[PDB]
Design a protein around this nucleic acid. Structure first.
Ligand SMILES: Nc1nc2c(ncn2[C@H]2CC[C@@H](COP(=O)(O)OP(=O)(O)OP(=O)(O)O)O2)c(=O)[nH]1
Ligand SMILES: CCN(C(=O)COc1nc(C)c(Br)c(C(F)(F)F)c1C#N)c1cccc(C)c1
Ligand SMILES: [Mg+2]
Length: 639
DNA sequence: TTCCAATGACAGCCGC
DNA sequence: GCGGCTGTCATTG
């Protein structure tokens, strides 16, 4: 039967619980948050509505130990157990002793780590296990887990416990989700039991699949690094953003007024229908789609398609970048600056990390706006600044996916190119546009980058035609030349597709499996799509494994030389100048740190050394380090 | 439906 | 009408 032991109701029961807890090598916790320094719990940073009122502990069976964190107001609180005494015993059981292997199971580890630090002033110091991450590791293409989906798949006999608990079918922790009529006590107690028992089953499945090493040494440590990043946030200038906005908005106004005079009437730039009516019916341009590729052809024939393309580019920077950044910005009173606090997302097909609310990975590259024949540089990245005195440090792998592909295909031609050869995208752009390397613009080098990765990951003649501006037949010849020049690669493509068809999956460098049952499908599209996913998942997934290992190994090093706080949050949660390096952003093959002026040399050495040593391949992992007063103004830095 | 991966704004439709 | 869904468009790696 489900039982909730209120450990704080009696001094004697409390000490028995504390003695037992201190013996445990494994337990689950769940935080109890409810809607309303207070007597009834700890406010949460970012919600004036919700309190941490307690937490539940489970170490077996259907017994939840509910540990109240309320001063006053289940049987009542034994008044000899002061809140200060409880917080002592809580910090004591949640921090490691020397040579003691201890694992805590937490649904949504990152959100719980942050609330414990910022709300209760407690820093977890044990090995962590999140059942959400274990689910991902067993099937990366599975839908994002909820407590309901985990219990459905791995603990189905306990589904009755979730009856009438509709919020269990949302992403957020049952304990953390105060948008329920059920008490935090009940929610946290149920969660603690479901998560402890679920994680036993998930651990057996990880062991069967041989993913337990990956889970404990890479994925959960990677989640800890991402928790520090989410506590850190990224510095933001609103002045820089506003001045860019005003230039962009002036260009949008001129574009609209010129578009409407060419069209003869107002039209919505957001309606494909309206644009199609104007381009194809009312001006009779030859094709009805209004995609980038269509308008890119037509801009040679009439000014309006080009105006449409520029309108969408600039509207994107204003409505999808400026508006969300200026809405999500938050004063940090300690650092004395505005910051943005994006949320990491690790549930991806290939093991990349992305961000939401907002997705800072999608902040535009620098681009140019001309008005009255005068150019203005729009660098949205220039709004992302370090704390006063600090620098942004970026360290990026040179052609990580190409180096991994060389290693796995042993392709002698690709190895030569990487070992000496200058920029491969410049070589492609030069041959293509009848030029020498030096003339290539940013936009053209990106077009050549798209062509090179496109061809490698199974792009067809029809599409390569559009990108290169040549006939399908010409593109098909170019594919043949590539396939002939790099045979190793082509053998590895066919050997990866053969092995996938047989097994129903592919594996990355660390052993993670992606299931591609489309590989057997009779439909030509679905089959070809799966074959392309098969090849791309191995290379892109392997690269994502290397960057995670690098991230984890850098964080260990930073914390040894750490005569200082491991995140900006660790100073908020604490309640003396800033020293060290703070993980602020991941960009797939690139890590950004915010670094104190004094420490930039040492942090740059650590970051480069650890990224170059992450794994041993047939080829050297080359790393470029850059540094600057903004993400937009980074300069090469020889380390 | 024929590079892969990702988030997110935004009209327009459809069963409730 | 209304929230859900579904492309379509954008951007980044
Ligand atoms: N399949 C595929 N992968 C891409 C594409 N663009 C980028 N990627 C992958 C492979 C490279 C990786 C990182 O992107 P970057 O622009 O940093 O690639 P890079 O080759 O390292 O470029 P750079 O040398 O300028 O850093 O992301 C694309 O269009 N298709
Ligand atoms: C196959 C002929 N060709 C090249 O070899 C260009 O250089 C490279 N192209 C590709 C797709 C790759 Br994958 C490479 C690689 F990086 F692998 F060596 C190169 C090179 N060098 C080429 C040159 C210009 C334009 C196009 C589409 C292809
Ligand atoms: Mg790169």
């Amino acid at each position: 039967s489900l039982s909730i032991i209120d450990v704080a109701s009696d001094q004697n029961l409390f000490q028995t619980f504390i003695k037992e807890w201190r013996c445990k090598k494994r337990f689950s916790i769940s935080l109890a948050c409810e809607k309303i320094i207070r007597d009834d719990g700890f406010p949460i940073k970012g919600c004036d509505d919700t309190l941490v009122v307690g937490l539940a502990v489970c170490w077996g069976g259907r017994d939840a130990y509910y540990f109240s964190l309320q001063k006053e107001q289940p049987p009542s609180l034994d008044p000899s157990l002061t809140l200060k005494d409880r917080m002592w015993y809580l910090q004591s059981c949640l921090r490691k002793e020397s040579d003691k292997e201890c694992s805590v199971v937490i649904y949504d580890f990152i959100q719980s780590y942050k609330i414990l630090l910022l709300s209760c002033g407690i820093s977890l110091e044990q090995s962590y296990e999140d059942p959400k991450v274990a689910c991902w590791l067993l099937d990366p293409d599975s839908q994002e887990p909820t407590l309901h989906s985990i219990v459905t798949s791995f603990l189905p006999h306990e589904l009755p416990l979730l009856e009438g608990m509709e919020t269990s079918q949302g992403i957020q922790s049952l304990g953390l989700n105060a948008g329920s009529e059920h008490s935090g006590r009940y929610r946290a107690s149920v969660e603690s039991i479901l998560i402890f028992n679920s994680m036993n089953q998930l651990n057996s499945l990880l062991q069967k699949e041989n993913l337990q090493d990956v889970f404990r040494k890479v994925e959960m440590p990677s989640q800890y690094c991402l928790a520090l990043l989410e506590l850190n946030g990224i510095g933001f200038s609103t002045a820089e953003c506003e001045s860019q906005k005003h230039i962009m908005q002036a260009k949008l106004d001129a574009i609209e007024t010129q578009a409407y005079q060419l069209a003869g009437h107002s039209f919505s730039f957001t309606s494909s229908d309206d644009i199609a009516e104007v381009l194809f019916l009312e001006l009779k341009l030859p094709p009805f789609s209004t995609s980038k590729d269509v308008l890119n052809k037509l801009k040679a024939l009439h000014p309006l398609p080009g105006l449409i393309l520029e309108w969408r580019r600039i509207t994107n920077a204003i409505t999808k970048v400026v508006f969300p950044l200026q809405r999500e910005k938050c004063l940090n009173p300690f650092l004395g600056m505005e910051r943005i606090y994006p949320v990491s997302q690790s549930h991806t097909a290939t093991g990349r990390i992305t961000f939401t609310e907002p997705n800072i990975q999608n902040v535009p590259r620098d681009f140019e706006i001309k008005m009255g024949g005068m150019p203005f540089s729009i660098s949205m990245r220039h709004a992302f600044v370090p704390f006063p005195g600090g620098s942004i440090l970026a360290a990026d792998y040179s052609q990580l996916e190409l180096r991994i592909l060389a290693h796995l295909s042993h392709d002698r031609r690709l190895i030569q190119v990487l070992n000496t050869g200058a920029d491969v995208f410049r070589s492609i752009a030069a041959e293509w546009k009848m030029i020498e390397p030096e003339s290539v613009g940013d936009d053209l080098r990106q077009q050549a980058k798209q062509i090179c990765y496109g061809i490698i990951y199974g792009m067809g003649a029809k599409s390569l035609g559009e990108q290169m501006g040549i006939k399908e037949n010409d593109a098909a010849c170019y594919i043949d030349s590539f396939k002939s020049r790099y045979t190793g690669i082509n053998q590895f493509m066919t050997e990866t597709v053969k092995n996938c068809k047989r097994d129903g999956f592919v594996q990355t460098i660390l052993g993670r499996r992606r299931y591609l049952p489309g590989i057997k499908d009779n439909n030509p599209y679905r089959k070809a799509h799966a074959e392309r996913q098969a090849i791309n998942t191995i290379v892109q997934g392997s690269a994502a494994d290397i960057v995670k290992i690098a991230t984890v190994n850098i964080q260990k090093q930073l914390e040894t030389f750490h005569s200082t706080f491991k995140s900006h949050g660790h100073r908020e949660g604490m309640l003396c100048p800033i020293r060290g390096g703070f993980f602020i952003l991941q960009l797939h093959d690139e890590l950004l740190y915010e670094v104190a002026e004094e420490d930039v040399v040492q942090v740059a050495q650590i970051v480069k050394n650890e990224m170059e040593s992450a794994v041993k391949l047939s080829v050297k992992l080359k790393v470029k380090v850059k540094i600057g007063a903004s993400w937009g103004e980074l300069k090469d830095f020889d380390v």
